[PDB]
Amino acid sequence: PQITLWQRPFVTVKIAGQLMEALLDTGADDTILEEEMSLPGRWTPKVVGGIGGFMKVRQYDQILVEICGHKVIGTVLVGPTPANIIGRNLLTQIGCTLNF
Amino acid sequence: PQITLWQRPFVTVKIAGQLMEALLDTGADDTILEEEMSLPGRWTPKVVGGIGGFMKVRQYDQILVEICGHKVIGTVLVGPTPANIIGRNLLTQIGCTLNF
Numbered sequence: 001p002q003i004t005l006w007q008r009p010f011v012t013v014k015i016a017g018q019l020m021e022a023l024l025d026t027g028a029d030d031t032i033l034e035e036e037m038s039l040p041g042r043w044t045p046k047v048v049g050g051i052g053g054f055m056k057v058r059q060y061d062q063i064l065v066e067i068c069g070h071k072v073i074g075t076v077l078v079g080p081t082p083a084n085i086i087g088r089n090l091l092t093q094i095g096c097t098l099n100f
Numbered sequence: 101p102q103i104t105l106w107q108r109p110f111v112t113v114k115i116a117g118q119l120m121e122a123l124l125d126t127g128a129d130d131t132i133l134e135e136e137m138s139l140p141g142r143w144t145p146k147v148v149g150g151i152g153g154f155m156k157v158r159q160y161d162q163i164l165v166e167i168c169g170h171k172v173i174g175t176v177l178v179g180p181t182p183a184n185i186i187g188r189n190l191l192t193q194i195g196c197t198l199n200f
């Protein structure tokens with residue numbers, strides 16, 4: 001699809017059998033999911049800095065993400081973010097471009 | 101142009117005779133420039149919340165922004181952001197779409 005930006009660019013994603021909406025975010029290097037997201041297995045501590053300051057997150061490697069049905073695999077961060085965010089690490093795998 | 105997302109999507113912008121680079125950010129509702137940015141005239145207090153928390157900003161209305169040479173006019177926030185960010189309020193005016 002081609003998506004205009006008059007509204008926030010949310011899409012439905014399925015991760016580890018769970019459904020959620022996440023923002024397609026060209027300003028994000030990394031993908032981050034909300035605190036209540038349950039991913040199994042080991043993780044590594046990471047800190048993410050946005051506008052406002054920094055927050056501690058859990059880094060999960062090799063997570064399968066189904067983004068508008070497209071299947072991709074990458075690193076997913078989990079922490080106390082206000083919204084689920086799909087960052088460039090996954091946007092590149094769905095062939096996402098900015099056009100104008 | 102069409103821009104891929106293997107790298108951060110920075111573009112050059114000119115605002116109030118000053119040049120800077122700014123991130124094209126679909127995850128941002130609003131446009132925010134770094135604390136050292138000098139805009140003339142009246143402004144209104146606003147607070148922006150990102151990942152990490154919130155920060156106090158100045159809201160300037162009807163600012164002319166030249167984005168990749170395109171001319172657009174909109175609200176611009178100025179505060180202690182780590183990077184200049186072009187949000188959807190301006191991205192819509194340059195006909196910016198996400199494609200995949």
Ligand SMILES: Cc1cccc(C)c1OCC(=O)N[C@@H](Cc1ccccc1)[C@@H](O)C[C@H](Cc1ccccc1)NC(=O)[C@H](C(C)C)N1CCCNC1=O
Binds near residue numbers: 026085125150
């Ligand atoms: C949502 C919003 C509403 C009104 C006004 C503004 C400016 C708004 O956006 C603020 C905002 O932080 N949006 C983020 C996503 C957002 C949407 C909704 C709520 C909260 C946040 C994101 O798009 C931009 C922001 C840019 C940035 C900040 C600091 C250093 C470098 C880059 N990017 C990041 O925080 C990313 C994260 C998300 C992986 N990030 C973290 C560090 C390393 N690099 C990097 O890419």
